[PDB]
Amino acid sequence: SEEEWNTGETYTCVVAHEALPNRVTERTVDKSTGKPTLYNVSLVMSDTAGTCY
Amino acid sequence: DWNSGERFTCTVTHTDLPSPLKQTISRPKGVALHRPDVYLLPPAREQLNLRES
């Protein structure tokens, strides 16, 4: 339905192939990770210079 | 007079026997004059970062 993904459900897909070393792998994506329509980065760089540089 | 480049010394003696104590309570004038270079340095970064004093 258009409710779980719209809610932001983080879906995951697992697959097992013989050729793979671990024999198992997976990926995942949610609403945001699904082509983020917009970022919300708010990084803060505290103490840009001190002791270390 | 006291600051006339003269190391003023008292002449107090004793009653039992004359003992002139010419102790130089005056500062040593002359010898050599030089500007006392003064540098005023601030606290280290670590001290301030510790935020104690």
Query: What is the DSSP annotation of A8-40?
Result: T--EEEEE--SSSSSS-EEEEE-TTTSS-SS--
User: How far apart are alpha carbons B13 and B24 in whole angstroms?
Assistant: 15
Instruction: Give B40→chain A minimum CA distance, Å.
Output: 21
Method: cryo-EM
Using a CB-CB cut-off of 8 Å, the residues of chain B touching A50 are 45, 49
Answer whether B23's CB lies under 8 Å from B12's CB: no
Contacts with B49 from chain A: Cβ below 8 Å: 47, 50-51
Q: Which residues of A touch B46 (CB under 8 A)?
A: 51
3-class secondary structure, B46: helix
Q: Which tokens belong to B49?
A: 């970062």
